[PDB]
Amino acid sequence: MMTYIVFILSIIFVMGFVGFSSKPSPIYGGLGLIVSGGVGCGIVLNFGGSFLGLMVFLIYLGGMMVVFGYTTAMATEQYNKVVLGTFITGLLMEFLMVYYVLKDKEVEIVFKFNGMGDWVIYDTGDSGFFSEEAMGIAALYSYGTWLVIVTGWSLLIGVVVIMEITRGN
């Protein structure tokens, strides 16, 4: 059961999306996307993506969903059947997926998926005195020159774009 733990988190992940995709209200939907971001971060962390998971917290959740909840609280003035039916529909489809891929150890929705716990696909070695993911992100400044240029230019242009379109003149 604990060998399936990432899978279990992924189930909660899918459940969290049926939280906000059914769209109850943008604030409860924001909360559902926050919970989804936390459990997807846990999925990332359990493969060895420590820095990427903390980017999910600091930049996706603590950076961007803060601005989503902030903008949302400045609208939709404070105080359904389609939401509840959509939520139970998505939940029953997800538990039928779980039931099939656990009873058969294999399923095929669009692609063939094994039903074993996802620990089986890992590597059996060590990376020495470094995280490989940390060194691959550190390579953004040594090997990623064009990527840094186009990303920083897009962010500068994005600042210019937001200041042009939010002015009305």
Binding site: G125, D126, S127, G128, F129, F130, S131
Partner: protein, 70 residues
Amino acid sequence: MWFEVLPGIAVMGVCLFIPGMATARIHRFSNGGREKRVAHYSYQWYLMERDRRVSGVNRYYVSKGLENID
């Protein structure tokens, strides 16, 4: 006078002294009278799991020296 504030500062300072003293004594109790093994990198974890395998008691901290070879 001003030293009347020192009992509350003393109580709060003891309350801040408790967690580090507690985790140091618990790390020395749980790891054979020594520090907890810091394994930030997979080589350190490899050495630690090798220690757990060569100890024979399924405890990484039980160290085997030159007495374990002939």
